[PDB]
């Protein structure tokens, strides 16, 4: 719990205030790099296949990329 206190704050407010916004941007990125790599249709089947087992997570996936612009 103490190493987790420092884990909020080990690189100071500054690495983290970077890191966190940096992570979410990479969050946008990972999703949207697999999203567009050729064209939407053929790619969605590649989207379909990374997490075949469950589809509740998928609904947020499909929902996210609707307003890319």
């Amino acid at each position: 719990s103490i190493v987790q206190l420092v884990q909020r704050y080990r690189s100071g407010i500054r690495g983290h205030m970077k890191a966190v916004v940096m992570d979410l941007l990479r969050q946008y990125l990972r999703v949207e790099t697999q999203f567009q790599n050729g064209h939407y249709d053929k790619c969605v089947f590649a989207l379909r296949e990374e997490n075949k087992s469950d589809m509740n997570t998928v609904l947020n996936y499909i929902f996210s990329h609707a307003q890319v612009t």
């Binding site: 080990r10 690189s11 690495g15 890191a19």
Partner: protein, 60 residues
């Protein structure tokens, strides 16, 4: 260890940062024993981004 001159991890930035941070405290620490060197050090110290850096002291 293996990837020399590769991409660095999060902590790698931190380890350089403590090393970088540690050198910085020494100059601060160095003036404490010998504050008279501070003033003369500035002309020499300013050789980087010098006009902005002289300005910052004047603002403060």
């Amino acid at each position: 260890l293996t990837e020399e001159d590769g991409v660095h991890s999060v902590i790698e930035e931190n380890i350089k940062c403590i090393s970088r941070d540690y050198v910085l405290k020494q100059i601060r620490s160095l003036v404490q024993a010998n504050p008279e060197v501070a003033m003369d050090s500035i002309i020499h110290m300013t050789q980087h981004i010098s006009p902005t850096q002289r300005a910052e002291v004047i603002r403060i």
